[PDB]
């Protein structure tokens, strides 16, 4: 008897890496939602957790994260900077208190060393390296409503280009509410960093570690959405999603926003997880 197996692994959620070659391990399949998101968060539409099974809900500051493996949640630094034991939920379209009673227990929070720590969050101008990892106590059981997202490769076909389409999803501010009750999502293109800089508001810092995204239709993520995955189609498989970006910060809700360029952190991510 192996974990997550019969030897069939429990497919479509797990896969084998098969009195025996070895003389067997069933491990999660990142990136493949059961029902893909259907377009009709600002400028978004209704999303089912099904569409975004990696989506994680942080409660204490209202934020999001992405499940990347059974022990690790990935989020923005700023989201855990001053919440070292965050309350995270998974598996749910509604974040209504009723529906809030699957929860993930944090074991350790790992902030990126290049994040600038602040005692008082208000008026941070510098969101460089807005990336942090959260190790869970118990492994997450995958299914229709809970599965990881893929990470980027360091290969160049992972370099994003202006116009690349991605997904944002969260329970943040909408045109109707300050915090959504049900999951919301939008499709939006990667934009040149000047677009972000041109929204008039010590100056905000823009680094190469930050994706700008947004455009004509004024789709955007906002407060409440932060730490969630900007989900991009795997360069070689259109049905598999990886986290190109993390919802970091933005000059003005409904304009253009800034997302942690995950690719630049893949080595660190990998190393943190191995060494822990
Ligand atoms: C500091 C903190 C810690 C925990 C939870 C929330 C916060 C928080 O309050 N902030 C973090 C997220 N943030 C963004 C991010 C993207 C935006 C965007 N893309 N467009 N318009 C506005 C945007 C605003 C607002 C400030």
Numbering used by the authors: 364 to 369, 384 to 394, 398, 410 to 411, 413 to 415, 419 to 435, 438 to 498, 501 to 600, ...
Paper lines:
To better understand the structural requirement of the 1-aminophthalazine moiety, we obtained crystal structural information of a 1-aminophthalazine 4e in complex with C1s, which, to the best of our knowledge, was the first report of a cocrystal structure between human C1s and a small-molecule ligand. The structure revealed that the amino moiety at the 1-position of the phthalazine ring and the nitrogen atom at the 2-position made a bidentate interaction with Asp626 in the S1 pocket of C1s as expected, thereby boosting potency. Furthermore, the nitrogen atom at the 3-position of the phthalazine ring does not undergo hydrogen bonding with the C1s protein directly and possibly plays a role in facilitating improved penetration into the S1 pocket compared to the 1-aminoisoquinoline (4b). In addition to potent C1s inhibitory activity, 4e showed good selectivity against not only C1r, MASP-2, and factor D, serine proteases involved in the complement pathway, but also other serine proteases such as thrombin and trypsin (IC50 > 30 μM, respectively). On the basis of the binding pose of 4e cocrystallized with C1s, a structure-based approach was performed to further enhance potency. In the case of 4e, the amide moiety was located around the S2 site. Because the S2 site is a lipophilic environment surrounded by His475 and Phe526, 4e is not likely to occupy the S2 site effectively. Furthermore, there are no substituents of 4e located in the S3 site. Therefore, enhancement of affinity in the S2 site and acquisition of a novel interaction in the S3 site were attractive targets for enhancement of C1s inhibitory activity. The crystal structure of a complex of C1s and a small-molecule inhibitor was solved, which demonstrated that the 1-aminophthalazine moiety of 4e fits tightly in the S1 site and suggested further opportunities to enhance C1s inhibitory activity by structure-based chemical modification around the S2 and S3 site.
